[PDB]
């Protein structure tokens, strides 16, 4: 899944 601070 996408990182925490995701883009």
């Amino acid at each position: 899944e996408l990182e925490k601070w995701a883009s």
């Epitope: 990182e3 925490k4 601070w5 883009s7």
Partner: antibody
């Protein structure tokens, strides 16, 4: 100045449970968006990401090790603990904990997320050998 | 999961050379990529964060560029302390993958 240091048993036997502690200074796990992660390195091999925990308490784990890892924090003691169950010989490695910056803020307003893209300060690493 | 491939895996060079290490991702990771240098017996040290920002206290001969699926680290004038292993790390998707590393050693 941020510093981190890993501690735990240097030797552990197969099937046992391994508890590693990261004690740090220079930041608080209550600071905005900060993270502390764990990375390991079997001798002669590449770095392998294990898990990370943030100050708002979100936790994430390597999918390959998810079932054997638990990461937790103790904010008031400035420590992050990683518990790995059922270890086997392939878990012998040097284990590092590391700091991850949270976004830069201006008058408490997040304005830059570029600084979160790296683990910026690392502990010296603790060598763990798994053998019966 | 997401794959990060470093090239070359090993590289020989001499003091004063310009080297460039590259890292390619299987899916785009935007600019969430970091480079590290790790000397034998020591922990990895952050050189470049967010694909191209120079980490504070890191010497200017180190440079990082690229975004998406292709990134490069170049050391413009290799110094003796640069004989080491370099790693790239992606932080866009969990898990936060590391590349296989590239060993830089003394050419002969």
């Amino acid at each position: 100045r941020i510093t981190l240091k890993e501690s735990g048993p240097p030797l552990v036997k197969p099937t046992q449970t391994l508890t590693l502690t990261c004690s740090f200074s220079g930041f608080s796990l209550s600071d905005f968006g900060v993270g502390v992660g764990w990375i390991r390195q079997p001798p002669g091999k590449a770095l392998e990401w294990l898990a990370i925990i943030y100050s708002d308490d979100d936790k994430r784990y390597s999918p390959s090790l998810n079932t054997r890892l638990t990461i937790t924090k103790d904010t008031s003691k400035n420590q992050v603990v990683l518990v790995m169950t059922r270890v086997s010989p392939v878990d012998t490695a040097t284990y590092f904990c590391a700091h991850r910056r949270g976004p830069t803020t201006l008058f408490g307003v997040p304005i830059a997320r570029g600084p979160v893209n790296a683990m910026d300060v690392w502990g010296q690493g603790i060598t763990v050998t798994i053998s019966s | 999961a997401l794959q990060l491939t470093q090239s070359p895996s090993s590289l020989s060079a001499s003091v004063g050379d310009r080297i460039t290490i590259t890292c390619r991702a299987s899916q785009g990771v935007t600019s969430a990529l970091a480079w590290y240098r790790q000397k034998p017996g020591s922990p990895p040290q952050l050189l470049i964060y967010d694909a191209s920002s120079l980490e504070s206290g890191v010497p200017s001969r180190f440079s990082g560029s690229g975004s998406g699926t292709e990134f490069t680290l170049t050391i413009s004038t290799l110094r003796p302390e640069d004989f080491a292993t370099y790693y790239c790390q992606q932080l866009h998707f969990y898990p936060h993958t590391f590349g296989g590393g590239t060993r830089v050693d003394v050419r002969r």
